[PDB]
Design an enzyme around this catalytic site. Structure first.
Site, PDB file in Angstrom:
ATOM      1  CG  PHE B 121       4.491 -10.041  -4.937  1.00 25.06           C
ATOM      2  CD1 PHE B 121       5.055 -10.531  -6.402  1.00 25.06           C
ATOM      3  CD2 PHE B 121       3.746  -9.079  -4.919  1.00 25.06           C
ATOM      4  CE1 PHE B 121       4.709  -9.734  -7.231  1.00 25.06           C
ATOM      5  CE2 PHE B 121       3.333  -8.266  -6.028  1.00 25.06           C
ATOM      6  CZ  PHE B 121       3.874  -8.685  -7.332  1.00 25.06           C
ATOM      7  CD  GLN B 122       5.916  -5.516  -6.203  1.00 28.28           C
ATOM      8  OE1 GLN B 122       5.307  -4.998  -5.428  1.00 28.28           O
ATOM      9  NE2 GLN B 122       6.367  -5.157  -7.441  1.00 28.28           N
ATOM     10  CE  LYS B 171      -0.771  -3.193   1.013  1.00 26.03           C
ATOM     11  NZ  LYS B 171      -1.983  -3.744   0.679  1.00 26.03           N
TER      12      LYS B 171
END
Ligand SMILES: Cc1cc2nc3c(=O)[nH]c(=O)nc-3n(C[C@H](O)[C@H](O)[C@H](O)COP(=O)(O)OP(=O)(O)OC[C@H]3O[C@@H](n4cnc5c(N)ncnc54)[C@H](O)[C@@H]3O)c2cc1C
Ligand SMILES: Cc1cc2nc3c(=O)[nH]c(=O)nc-3n(C[C@H](O)[C@H](O)[C@H](O)COP(=O)(O)OP(=O)(O)OC[C@H]3O[C@@H](n4cnc5c(N)ncnc54)[C@H](O)[C@@H]3O)c2cc1C
Ligand SMILES: Cc1ncc(C[n+]2c([C@@](C)(O)OO)sc(CCOP(=O)(O)OP(=O)(O)O)c2C)c(N)n1
Ligand SMILES: Cc1ncc(C[n+]2c([C@@](C)(O)OO)sc(CCOP(=O)(O)OP(=O)(O)O)c2C)c(N)n1
Ligand SMILES: Cc1ncc(C[n+]2c([C@@](C)(O)OO)sc(CCOP(=O)(O)OP(=O)(O)O)c2C)c(N)n1
Ligand SMILES: COc1cc(C)nc(NC(=O)NS(=O)(=O)c2ccccc2OCCCF)n1
Ligand SMILES: COc1cc(C)nc(NC(=O)NS(=O)(=O)c2ccccc2OCCCF)n1
Ligand SMILES: [Mg+2]
Ligand SMILES: [Mg+2]
Ligand SMILES: [Mg+2]
Lengths: 582, 582, 287
Positions: B121-122, B171
């Site tokens: 995702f992304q 992240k």
């Protein structure tokens, strides 16, 4: 049988060979913003009677328009940009198209060949930059290659797993005179050698077999079925297996249908995720087991025999290991399984009504629900009204965030290519330009961009394009003055500590800021705001009935939370079903 | 001596280590747009009392703001973006910064490490994408490397030939707890080993020698002298050599000065290009012999001994071969030559007044000139009035096109870092965000974005940012309803055949479209239009005197042509000096 | 050390590759072009402006001929042991400096550089930048085929020679008159030399013979030649060297001469890596 505008022995500029190469591909529309390195191409375009240019106001606008055109039609979208900053402005569009497997042909001017590598005026190594975010790209090094490279780029963009292909054309090649040869063969030995064959009945029968042996089957349907609407419908009636869909699959199977589990994944319905959690047979047709959909993989369909039919062998067993696999066009696989099914109908005597009942109980205990506070407009309700007043027949494009989930959850797509949304990259600013392309591809359709105020403003400049091209684009702007999706996560996991997610003016903290109505006014687009739920239905009706483009600013309480939510990497047992920012 | 907000033994999140790494670099301002992959960084930022975030409305806005901040101050500009579409929206900014040698540190969130490569995702491989359009980049693979990588990125961005450096932070590293070690050494053995040494007097004396032996010397000054204003001034007085400047050098040597030849190149003054054509000694300080400046290289300074002083050895002899070369900081070379000059003043008895006279004759025969038609506002005149009413003290940022050349030609920059303009990439949409960064870096300065209607609209969304951050940005919007520079080339070389260069509404072909005043109104920015040359001076005075931001829409006949013009790849003998689109 | 290199010279760099110009040392003057043209042009200017220039550097040339006399290249001769330098010098003498010389890499390569007088370019074939062992024998094969009437000699070392020993089959079958002057010291000599100067003569795998029969020449390169039908001989006593080499030269066709040499020799002089002129080692070996 194509008719050129040039004698078959008459030399013409490379720019003209390139435009004719586009005409011979069936292109009628391109989204091109002119610059020095592509001026020749733009002159060649003015000479074509069959190709229209929609000039955007920003090249990101252009590429997102070409995506909208592609996603809303099944044809490739074509954008053209100049070199340097023109080319680099396409990059989010290319990445977006690659992640969503959208067919796209991007053409960029380049500095003259002799200049390449020298840090020349408006040079960037776009073929380097984009190599990892396109399906394939090209640097044309000789005017003789223009026919063959355009043919290869369209063929690669549209065949197999569709995606973006970029063709860099140096300015001197655009100017060189030549006589094109349209009979050149394509040089794709390996790629063509690896195109999947039609499915063997060996594999197809084994699947229909597994179906009859199973008690709790679920279809898991994605963007790969967007050309299989009919086959998939037939397949569902011959088997009565309930249908869960991904964000990209919406409308493959009709949203308003008794067998429809709606969308699964992180923001999927409680019942759809339940069906998968407790299924024994999972029919994964045209999907890629994305992390938004699976959560913890070991937990995903933890007790199902997994059948994965995908046209890209690299996808098969990439995140979840299937029991059965079939590398091929899901449309063929469905046509084959449908023959077997209808024939062996009797010996099979397929009845899953008892499993379908277990799910319709979840479907009744845990439907999608929203609160209505006072006279405040609930975004979910506004989308539902738009559905009602358009009869589920609109083409819907969106931005990214909470409003995108709502446009997924509360609109009933009946057919594929009604739902235009950035799923894999998740690119804000996609909604308005994507509606522009969808409108041009579908001039008689209702086209509505369900947008958020953060996303909408990012490409607000394309309102000029809507006006000038006299496109009947409707904007349902759900306005909460926040980057709502990041706000929601701030609420759940950061104690509602706000880090730059408020989009209004802190000085006049209770005024809607900016005033999107004036953005519309600047480009001569009729517009209105609405704040009271009482006025919503007549407001939307007005937007729909007013000929031409129209912006409706819909004010919404910002404390809403998209639900349900399985936190990133979670299991079904972690699904949040209640709560907001209040 | 730095004071942390954490105990020297207290673990904190990687996001917090990263923010403190920024504080220890002196950062006070960052341009950051939040997304999922960078939410941790945004929370860490809210905890810093010394770093302000200017939240833009589009990440291209953010990076262009960081460029403005950098170019207007000599400090590095810092933008932060989320992963995927956040990161890809920086790409034009990075390329721009690299081509203009602007120091920039870009920080992007990335998906968690375990997810990298999985099409998560992304996710986009931003380190791949940007490798060829940054000076250097990094993918942080361990929270322990955050201190060292931030220190290396600032050091690479600001030392040597400045440029952009991008740091990708997954992240999970942002969330990991750790105790930073701020004493880690940097791992740049090769780069540091190849930093130029201070210039040897051996090479310096040989240059002062060549000066006294020469009869027609010209200084050729570029972006590399922007930190050498004083040294270069001293050098000019000890030698009285006339000074030609590139687009990037403007204001190194004061524009209004008797020794100033103004700008050379494709749109250089007739006299400046004459000086170079007929010089015998060419002092190329801080320039890169760009094709916009040289035209046909064999013809460029065809009879001059060429002295090239550049801090990047790769630039030396890359397009033109110097006689003498000096790889080092031009500021030091000037300080050394200035000592030699002042000392050996007598033995040298330097007097070029006879060459300076030959040029002041050209300067008088062929000054920059514009026509005034009726009451129509000439853009050149409007810029000249802005110069008059600001006393040449404003910081000027621009878009790209005709209006950019005019802002170069008709404003008298007195110091460097007054002129903020995209020179190498030539990126439209740069003006408004660049003014935002310059204003934040220079809160007491007059800041004016001399913009064109095509460029201005591309990033019009940043007006929200101006308003919300209560920045006194003035917009002098020169409006001709056209992509004027492409229009001009259409006129000279394509028989005035228009291919998508008209920006207004063909249906109401005589109305100013869009209405930029309403764009300003939407964001609560006072604005006015002006059409009659009589009203111009009071209009601009109003813009200047009205506290806060302000937009002035200046209507202009579109048939103007930037002059003079040496066609691409030409010689001095091809210089066009007359004509427009009438 | 670059800062020390030609530290007080105006540097004129003429190179055909612009990337080379000012890449490690910054020239004063530069000229990107074919040195052959630059020479032809400068030669016209020189001969024409001969008088106005009146060029005479005899005084500088004299300062150097004093160094040339104080510090020539020198080698010791121990007993009857063959010095490699001397063997190369004899090969030079008996070929009249007219041979094409290819080499391996190591001490023997420096000696073939120092003690043979190349008269023309393309006589000296040697791996300089990569420094690839095993280059000598095959390079002689190509030079011979390109120059079928030339004396071709591969001045090789025993480590380098064995790496591509299989090409002796090629020499024989293609009936090429390749001569092999194999300088044999039973060691990876160049690494041995550095072991001596900087690692206290601690040997780490630089001995190429058989530890079990530690005083026998191993392997026996003569049998490698015999396997491919190449006449060969060994020589150990300096007295026999000149007739040995003469034999190699006079025997038509390919020929291998195994020249045994004391291994403690050291290529000199030596400026240690990254040093200046002031660090030049001029004396010493492994004894
Ligand atoms: C804020 C946000 C939240 C999101 N949350 C969710 C969510 O809760 N649920 C959700 O579903 N998505 C969600 N996503 C979207 C998500 O990240 C992915 O885009 C989506 O899950 C992947 O769709 P897909 O599996 O259908 O694969 P696609 O990206 O649609 O790829 C199609 C697949 O089919 C294959 N294929 C293509 N054509 C054929 C053919 N003819 N035959 C066979 N195979 C073919 C391709 O090889 C590929 O494997 C969210 C996105 C955002 C922005
Ligand atoms: C529409 C348009 C028209 C244009 N036409 C013109 C034109 O007519 N004239 C014109 O000049 N430009 C023009 N350009 C701009 C152009 O393309 C280049 O940007 C400009 O010519 C290059 O500037 P520069 O030579 O100073 O090099 P820069 O891009 O400013 O690079 C600086 C150079 O100095 C070196 N340097 C940096 N710091 C130091 C230091 N401390 N010491 C020594 N060296 C250092 C760097 O290594 C580099 O070589 C135009 C641009 C546009 C958009
Ligand atoms: C180019 C770009 N920049 C930043 C992004 C990161 N995201 C998002 C997400 C889901 O990807 O999480 O990362 S969604 C989102 C905020 C949405 O703004 P809105 O439309 O006005 O409000 P709404 O109420 O959510 O409908 C951001 C900032 C992004 N995806 N694209
Ligand atoms: C992101 C981007 N896209 C396209 C570009 C190619 N160019 C230009 C050029 C010079 O690079 O020639 O190529 S200038 C230009 C038109 C200028 O629009 P204006 O500011 O409204 O009008 P003005 O009257 O010239 O002041 C274009 C379309 C560009 N550089 N950046
Ligand atoms: C493919 C290869 N492998 C290893 C090498 C590293 N080097 C050398 C050096 C100088 O590069 O120092 O590194 S030289 C050398 C030893 C020479 O063996 P000799 O020829 O039998 O003995 P001689 O007495 O020196 O003439 C080695 C092991 C090399 N260059 N090539
Ligand atoms: C202000 O400068 C302008 C403006 C306009 C509208 N157009 C042109 N055209 C050319 O410069 N063509 S070019 O000669 O082939 C060329 C030469 C060198 C490097 C790149 C080149 O092309 C790409 C540059 C952008 F096109 N220049
Ligand atoms: C709607 O989805 C949202 C929305 C918001 C605001 N935030 C998050 N955060 C996470 O998904 N974090 S993640 O678990 O580490 C993660 C897991 C897998 C792939 C990528 C990941 O991160 C980057 C994704 C964008 F952040 N997801
Ligand atoms: Mg919102
Ligand atoms: Mg304009
Ligand atoms: Mg040896």
């Amino acid at each position: 049988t194509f008719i050129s505008r040039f004698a078959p022995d008459q030399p013409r500029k490379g720019a003209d060979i390139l435009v004719e190469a586009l005409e011979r591909q069936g292109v009628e529309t391109v989204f091109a913003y002119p610059g020095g390195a592509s001026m020749e191409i733009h002159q060649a375009l003015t000479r074509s009677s069959s190709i229209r240019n929609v000039l955007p106001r920003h090249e990101q606008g252009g590429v997102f328009a070409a995506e909208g055109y592609a996603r809303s039609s099944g044809k490739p979208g074509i954008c053209i940009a100049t070199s340097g900053p023109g080319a680099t402005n396409l990059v989010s569009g290319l990445a977006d198209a690659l992640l969503d497997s959208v067919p796209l042909v991007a053409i960029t001017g380049q500095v003259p060949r002799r200049m390449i590598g020298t840090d020349a005026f408006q040079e960037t190594p776009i073929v380097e930059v984009t190599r990892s975010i396109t399906k394939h790209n090209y640097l044309v090094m000789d005017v003789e290659d223009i026919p063959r490279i355009i043919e290869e780029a369209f063929f690669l963009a549209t065949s197999g797993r569709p995606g973006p292909v970029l063709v860099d054309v140096p300015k001197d090649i655009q100017q060189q005179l030549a006589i094109p040869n349209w009979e050149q063969a394509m040089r794709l030995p390996g790629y063509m050698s690896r195109m999947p064959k039609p499915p063997e009945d060996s594999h197809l029968e084994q699947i229909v077999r597994l179906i009859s042996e199973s008690k709790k089957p679920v279809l898991y349907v994605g963007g790969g079925c967007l050309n299989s609407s009919d086959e998939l419908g037939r397949f569902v009636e011959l088997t009565g297996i309930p249908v869960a869909s991904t964000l990209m699959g919406l409308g493959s199977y009709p949203c308003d249908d008794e067998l429809s589990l709606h969308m699964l994944g992180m923001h999927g319905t409680v019942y759809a995720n339940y069906a998968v959690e407790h299924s024994d047979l999972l029919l994964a047709f045209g999907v890629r087991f994305d992390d938004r959909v699976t959560g913890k993989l070991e937990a995903f369909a933890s007790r199902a025999k997994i059948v994965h039919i995908d046209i890209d062998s690299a996808e098969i067993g990439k995140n979840k290991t299937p029991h059965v696999s079939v590398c091929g066009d899901v449309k063929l696989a469905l046509q084959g399984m449908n023959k077997v099914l209808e024939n062996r109908a009797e010996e099979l005597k397929l009845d899953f009504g008892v499993w379908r009942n277990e799910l319709n109980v979840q479907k009744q205990k845990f439907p999608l629900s929203f609160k209505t506070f006072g006279e405040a407009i609930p975004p979910q309700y506004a989308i539902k009204v738009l559905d009602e007043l358009t009869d589920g027949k609109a083409i819907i494009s969106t931005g990214v965030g909470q409003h995108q989930m709502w446009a997924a959850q509360f609109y009933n797509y009946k057919k594929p290519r009604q739902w235009l949304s950035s799923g894999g990259l998740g690119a804000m600013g996609f909604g308005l330009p994507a509606a522009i392309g969808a409108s041009v591809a579908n001039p008689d359709a209702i086209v509505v961009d369900i947008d958020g105020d953060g996303s909408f403003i990012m490409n607000v400049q394309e309102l000029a394009t809507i006006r000038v091209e006299n496109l009947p684009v409707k904007v349902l702007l759900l306005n909460n003055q926040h980057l709502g999706m990041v706000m929601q996560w701030e609420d759940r996991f950061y104690k509602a500590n706000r880090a730059h997610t408020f989009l209004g003016d802190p000085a006049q903290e209770d005024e809607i800021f900016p005033n999107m109505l004036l953005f519309a006014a600047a480009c001569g687009i009729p517009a209105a705001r609405v704040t009271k739920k009482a006025d919503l239905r007549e407001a939307i009706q007005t937007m729909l009935d007013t000929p031409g483009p129209y912006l409706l600013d819909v004010i919404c309480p910002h404390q809403e939370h998209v639900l349900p939510m399985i936190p990133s990497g979670g299991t079904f047992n972690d699904v949040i079903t209640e709560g907001d920012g209040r």
